[PDB]
Symmetry: C2
Subunit: 225 residues, 2 copies
């Protein structure tokens, strides 16, 4: 039942994301009593957690310490200055380390995502290689997730897969001007229909040819203005 | 701003719970493809995670290894037999360890809740000891959370505190027959109103006397049938 397990993986990854956001709200609100300005200075949750985590108190931040995170000099100065002039409150090391329990959890969740993503790839490359050849591990598991199972996906016509539409995230689609996407999504759906079927029956790998045929048809679609 | 930080802690605890549940739904569904029966055999999420976590594959479970978790022999038999007769599928060690990332995260969350709870008690015992004397750390931060701040709580009359009603969770209340609760909640509200105020002003500790006066009035309420 190897396809089921890949779905569970992708579903776990979504649950990690919901969570990362939940804990990041919390961390941002929480740590913000101490350093209110950092919040709007950093959009990315992983970075915010990293600061609260490795450095802690606004007064322990440094040029060197921050270059150690790939922040450019233009931004290093905004942070470090808003560290000095800071409107926020003072914090005991017990307050810091309690905030950090949440911060480090967020960091832990980021690694688990990466890890589950590698698990997702190994599996999908074995249970549905021709689907993965087309849309990649994640999207491929995601279709299965909505489909219910590989067998259930392989029983869908192209017209059904096209709406699950979610395949509209495929770069060749998402890149294209809105008018072209109808016809492109139709070509992908068509290849996915075959791809899910040779995979279901566990036949020979036609990923190369499936991709070439998609590129040809997309070019013809595109060279028709 | 030490009261705010206590609130953030309690709010973080709730977020942990929402999460524990989310991850355990997922883990139960996921690991269930392997051991479908374990699900209804164990209601507690911490235990389920512990099995998936330390043991893994249904077939590695044992009497001794299960006594190592405080399960009674009446229960150990149900599990270990539903291990043999198991309707579930087979799994690679890659599938197990991927499930486990979720399982261990759940275990990690349980620790953080305990730790945050210890943080919560140290703090509340300093910032609002008289409130904590009354209702305890958790409930006390929870009122603050609803109130917004210690100052804002200390501005509420008894009649407003009584509805935030959440104080109805206090044992002497929740224990009592529905009819008595009105008058008991009234007495607690009254003592909390004073307790929040000596706390706000940061006055002298009247926790002992406040508790004695509540026990007296509760007795009188009770010995009135």
């Amino acid at each position: 039942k190897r396809d089921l397990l890949a779905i569970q993986a992708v579903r776990a990854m979504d649950d990690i994301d919901k969570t990362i956001n939940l804990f990041s709200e919390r961390l941002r609100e929480w740590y913000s009593i101490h350093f209110p300005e950092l919040d709007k200075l950093i959009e990315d949750h992983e970075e915010y957690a990293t600061i609260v985590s490795r450095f802690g108190d606004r007064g322990f931040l440094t040029i060197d310490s921050l270059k150690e995170l790939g922040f450019n000099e233009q931004r290093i100065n905004r942070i470090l200055d808003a560290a000095k002039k800071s409107i926020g409150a003072d914090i005991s090391e017990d307050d810091l380390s309690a905030m950090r329990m949440i911060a480090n959890t967020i960091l832990d969740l980021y690694n688990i995502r990466r890890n589950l993503n590698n698990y997702l790839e190994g599996v999908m490359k074995e249970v549905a290689p021709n689907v993965t050849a087309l849309v990649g591990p994640a999207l491929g598991a995601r279709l299965l997730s909505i489909a219910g199972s590989l067998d259930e996906l392989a029983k869908m016509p192209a017209s059904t897969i096209q709406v699950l539409g979610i395949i509209f995230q495929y770069p060749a689609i998402h890149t294209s001007p809105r008018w072209q996407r109808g016809k492109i999504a139709r070509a992908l759906a068509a290849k996915l229909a075959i791809a899910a079927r040779v995979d279901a029956f566990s036949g020979r790998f036609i990923g190369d040819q499936l991709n070439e045929q998609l590129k040809k048809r997309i070019d013809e679609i595109k060279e028709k203005f």
